[PDB]
DNA sequence: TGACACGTGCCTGGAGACTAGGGAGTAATCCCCTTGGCGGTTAAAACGCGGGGGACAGCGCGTACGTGCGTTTAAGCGGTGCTAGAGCTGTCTACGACCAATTGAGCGGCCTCGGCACCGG
DNA sequence: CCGGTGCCGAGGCCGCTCAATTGGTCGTAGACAGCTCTAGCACCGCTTAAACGCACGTACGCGCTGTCCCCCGCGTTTTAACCGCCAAGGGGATTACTCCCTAGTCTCCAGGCACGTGTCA
């Protein structure tokens, strides 16, 4: 199965429950996946950039923190 | 206690990275850091989405709620 | 163009400053700078409140709309 | 006091510039409160910069620096 | 004098000459200075970020290239 | 040769950096690299402004020309 | 909505494709995707052309406006 | 005349959505040339990806990815 | 030590508060169709124990690569004054190409049938 | 070793939408001259450029330890996906109840601008 589909329907529901949402329309799930993908792409693009600057082949935890800062947490 | 499943999230992260640069290894604490940030982001977005739903006197959140929340926050929409 | 009148705007800015620090003054170009920023801020805030109003089944913006808009922005 | 100096028609004008079609009567008092908070925060930072430089005259650059760190 | 004033009027004129303009209005100079400052601020902000990631105290040539790439597009 | 003066450009670069992070020292080849990029950027901007000036049947570039060039590329 | 007609646009896409690859197939959702992008691109290009017209204190866009807009954007012609 | 299927009133309508108030008669030929170039470039990349993946079928995601990387 | 902002006078149309008044636009209310929530469940992809490697980040150190101070100075370059030359606009006259109202004519679209590959279980 | 599916390709018929005609005309092309203004010449002052010098801050490269990523057998394992009944609600139409937005009128005043003056860059 596609890897984007591993962000399962019950997982997105749980995130919404933690956000205080009581009922969730069927169209939320596809919308949430799109939003997540955009966020991930941006962060990872910066993260990999940091990795290359350090002349490494393994992205480090520190790479992500700088990526997150320049994205805005 | 992460709400998104660990293994599928990690798989997705590696897939996206391959298009920026092939043959990269992710540190475990790097993925856990990225996952904590992502889930906090989605939970926060769902908090704002819920506020938008309550604003329209609807107990059910809809795609238009997510789109409104991201537009008012200033995210590209 | 500036949308709020200079003198009432100046009085408010001077009034707030008097409570923060004693006898501080402001340059003319400083107040005009603050006013351009202020007018841009209110216009932007009014854009989001209107967007929030349209989201609801109305076209009239209400006090509750601004507070929702400011809460989601992370201000208050 | 000073917020009541800002005219009702000016806030309406601001909404027109923001592309607003109609205005509830209760917005104006609410808007005034919001405005006061914004100014306080910006001015608080502006005066902080002035004090750090050990100056007594607020400069245009002081406000701009305050504004940048507030918008950021 | 102020450090922004070190990009002198004849220097801005020379940049404009290389850009193919034959005559330059008096208001160009102040406008050009503002544009340059915005550009510089943005690049340096990223540049310094890279320096901190590498745990260095000296901004290097490599720091600038990554800053420029992300601002170049 | 770099059309911008080296030493004043370097002074400006250090000033801006000091606000982001204090006590940083710039590598020489880093400043020359930054300056080449800046001069290339300004020259390119001057090319586009001139195209806008010629478009408007003028030969003298004006602030509105610079603002148009930056707007269509997507700077502001 | 799609301001360009669907069927003639699809024919053009197929027409252009015949020169790149002989008898290559397509998908329906692929053409609709390309069209949303295409219409957004043309609308945006028309925005810049209008800015060029206004710069010259005119209100009528001319071929020189399109050519100026694409050159400053960095579009090779 | 498949290029002619992008009619004059359609291009005018696109321009209206772009904020255009007045439209020269010479715009139409110019716009068509511009459009053709755009389509060629995107499709050229799209078909390249299909051949690289040894699939021979243009997918919707291929076009979206091509379009994304074009803008960069 | 001189230039900047503070404080007050004159006034007049621009702008700001009531006072009627029509009403587009709010807010409860019912029925319905939609439509998620929840209960069962079972195969299953996630979680994990652990060997096994081992690629690779983290850390310490030598050193030379180079930045900072700073010091003089001869010298190319910026600032300022002034000038003569060229360029930025309004209202001149005009026209032609751009706008719209009207009418055949044709292609866009809804719904559907028939045939061909095609990755695939 | 054969199969359900998406595809072109066409048709039948309604069906909005073109090109073309004609007319009214808004806007755009030279332009004369008043006006700014600025590119250039000429000094004069001056701040960049540079070469040591010396002192050292530390970045880069290289080697060593670790440690944690990748891999996977593979065992078990809490659970995601699907069906289906149930009940909450989104919403569209209905209808009562406005106060919100206009005009008229009376009043308050924002700013040129000008003069007098305390204070700190």
Author numbering:
A (entry chain H), E (entry chain B): 23 to 95
B (entry chain G), G (entry chain C): 59 to 135
C (entry chain E), F (entry chain A): 59 to 134
D (entry chain F), H (entry chain D): 24 to 95
Authors' description from the paper:
In the present study, we determined the cryo-EM structures of a nucleosome-like particle, the H3-H4 octasome, which has unique features not found in the canonical nucleosome. In these structures, an ∼120-bp DNA segment and four copies of H3-H4 dimers formed a stable core particle without H2A and H2B. A novel H4-H4’FHB, assembled by the helix–loop–helix regions of the two inward-facing H4 histones, connected the two disks. First, the H3-H4 octasome lacked the acidic patch provided by H2A and H2B, which functions as a docking site for a variety of nucleosome binding proteins.
Single-particle analysis identified three well-resolved structures, indicating that the H3-H4 octasome exists in alternative conformations. The three structures, namely the open, closed, and intermediate forms, were similar but differed by the clamshell opening angle of the two stacked disks formed by the symmetrical halves of the H3-H4 octasome. The open and intermediate forms of the H3-H4 octasome structure were determined at 3.9 Å and 4.3 Å resolution, respectively. The histone core arrangement and DNA wrapping configuration were similar to those of the closed form, but differed in the distances of the opening measured between the two DNA gyres at the farthest points from the dyad, which were 7.7 Å and 1.7 Å wider in the open and intermediate forms, respectively. The H3-H4 octasome exhibits larger interdisk spacing between DNA superhelical gyres compared to the nucleosome. This is probably due to the lack of the H2A-mediated L1-L1’ interaction and the steric repulsion of the extended unstructured N termini on the two inward-facing H3 molecules. The interdisk spacing appears to be dynamic, as evidenced by the alternative conformations of the H3-H4 octasome structure. The wider interdisk space and the dynamic nature of the clamshell structure suggest that the H3-H4 octasome could provide greater access to DNA-binding factors, such as pioneer factors, which prefer to interact with the DNA along the gyre.
